[PDB]
Amino acid sequence: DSLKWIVFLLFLIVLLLLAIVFLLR
């Protein structure tokens, strides 16, 4: 489903932003 695609991509984005947050510090 399109909304499930959106949720999965947003979860990937959350993971990548967490990685960036911990790469900065």
Ligand X SMILES: CCCCCCCCOCCOCCOCCOCCO
> Is residue 14 within the footprint of ligand X (CB under 6 A)?
yes
CB of 1: closest distance to ligand X in angstroms? 7
- DSSP states along 1-25: -HHHHHHHHHHHHHHHHHHHHHHH-
> Is residue 21 within the footprint of ligand X (CB under 6 A)?
no
Cα–Cα distance for residue pair 12/24, rounded to 1 Å: 18
CB of 20: closest distance to a second copy in angstroms? 6
Name the residues that contact ligand X, by CB under 6 A: 4-5, 8, 11, 14
